[PDB]
């Protein structure tokens, strides 16, 4: 029952942000904005009012591009491959709505419901990939399956919203490449605590989660080979105006402030040491699961040493997590997320309570949670 | 050459916002956020970090609904008919992508390019409506035309981004209703200086303009008869999850902060007196056009007494406004918008410089502009 690695990171992180009113263990849903991030945003809006809205935006180009670059660095793409979105669903929809010719797709059974929804809405046939009892892709079986039965692209949610299994992203991406098939990665969850530098052809993620930037921002990155094959829904493909596929994908009103906010927030991840941060988040999972290994009416779902901060609890006596969550919030200020089946229809047989705490979490807090979980009605 | 009505409104408005670095005459592109609005936004983001992101959002429901209601009041819809968007293009796309059965449409020749683009992208046949030499719809001819040749809906940009003609919105809407045809109104420009209470079946607008709220927010309002006929692209119409058409349209990650920001900003319009504000904006146009009636190399396009703050200048010696604009900004701190043909392809034969100043503008400033316009190379 091993103890915690003391890191000045956990502490710097905590103090860089407003103090939690209660106890916040859902950076997986929406993390917490640093003062700098918050202020960077406010600043932009202030500046919009001074110099003019679109001149302010121009002025922010350095900062916007900063963020692209930072994002690019974490996924191994070019900054010029990275576009801004409203989030990871805007992202996957921009992508799939743009996707040329044949629209077959393989993905995990664990695939995110709203993703499947976008997949379906864009007319993709969607096969499952072989997995283990956890939902972790069997990379071998999948390679064989993908050669035998080819598919127009593979969509890998590298880290799932509903379960803290880290998918073997890089080895699936090579397997898929060996079969001559592109890989889209949903890194909404993964960007910030999984090595997202893995060879993917497109990646997307959201600002508000592990990168702890503003809501209303996400990113989509597409390798230029793929980017230029894409056919944006809007404008129509018979286009008088000459702009690139990515320029088309990034077209539309948006909170630029939030985007500069985001840029700060990514910068801050890089600043803290990507690799340093992921190791802590992995530890956070360990501690979280070791601390929660002993709770009646609640089973920990993920293997102890999954390198992840998402841990999920299945109720062993029919308790509904949705309720437990809103209890935990209203009574004890503890913020959690409650994952309904719709999050992963073809894998979740039963809902779960999701702890997703950041580096800042202490063993006290994990213990406060465990405690408060027991006292829960 | 009549003078200005002194109103404590102009002054209250100015002082409620950060002071303009130079001179800002493009509230038509992006206006200026009050301190309250800016702070309301920051606050939300701060609060996200304290209590949790989605609990903060819940908490803001009062404020969010406030804004719907306020918007609703200005267009004569129910607050429950109003949904939040990213802007007026998200809006028209959400609408047209959702539109059932036959997709014919009539609109002005003056129709906004990006609108036509969305129209086309959603497979609408798009007829023009009869207009005068200004582009103002001939309501009579149009009624006759719409009875003789029916169309699945009419799309009226009530106030055009490229020209400060106020379209006879209410009388066209009855004409269209007398022919049994619904009206969608693009009130991106109009919401805030035209009476948008006119009988339209859907209306949409943006936060960042005359309502001077945050970027990344717009609104879409749809009357329930129409709302429930609509078929959202995403999720697919074969939907396991039971949510209303509007709930579907409002689904997706977003800057909630910005939305509460917006709510403040609408509130502030109501607070100032809608009718009071529009009368000033109309005066602003008068003054703007009277002050600019005498400039060489620049003709005022709109009739003097169009009840509008948008005035546009056509260069009489081949000057490119794009350039003049970026000169005006870099040299004299005067912010303007330069309207390229793409803004209204089937009406604009030639680009224009657009003054769109708010209530705060003084005759000095309009004169400073006129002056600075002369000295421009
Ligand atoms: C993020 N989502 C959540 C609210 C959560 O609690 O998990 C998410 C997204 C959705 O992207 P948006 O930015 O549009 O919200 C994408 N896919 C995954 C795996 C996920 O974690
Ligand atoms: C607003 N647009 C401008 C940038 C301008 O300078 O006019 C606009 C919109 C576009 O909506 P978004 O909120 O997506 O930008 C819609 N239609 C009109 C008439 C217009 O003024």
Residue numbers in the entry:
A (entry chain A), B (entry chain A): -5 to 371
What does the paper say about this structure?
EgtE and Egt2 are PLP-dependent C-S lyases in EGT biosynthesis, leading to the conversion from sulfoxide 4 to EGT. Each MsEgtE monomer has 15 α-helices and 11 β-strands and is classified into three domains based on the domain assignments of NcEgt2.
The captured structure confirms the presence of the intermediate 15, which is formed by transaldimination with Lys203 during the C-S cleavage reaction. Remarkably, phenylalanine substitution for Tyr106 results in a 6.5-fold decrease in kcat, while a 1.5-fold increase in catalytic efficiency (kcat/Km) compared with the wild type. This implies that Y106 plays a crucial role in substrate binding, and specifically, the phenolic hydroxyl group of Y106 contributes to the substrate catalysis.
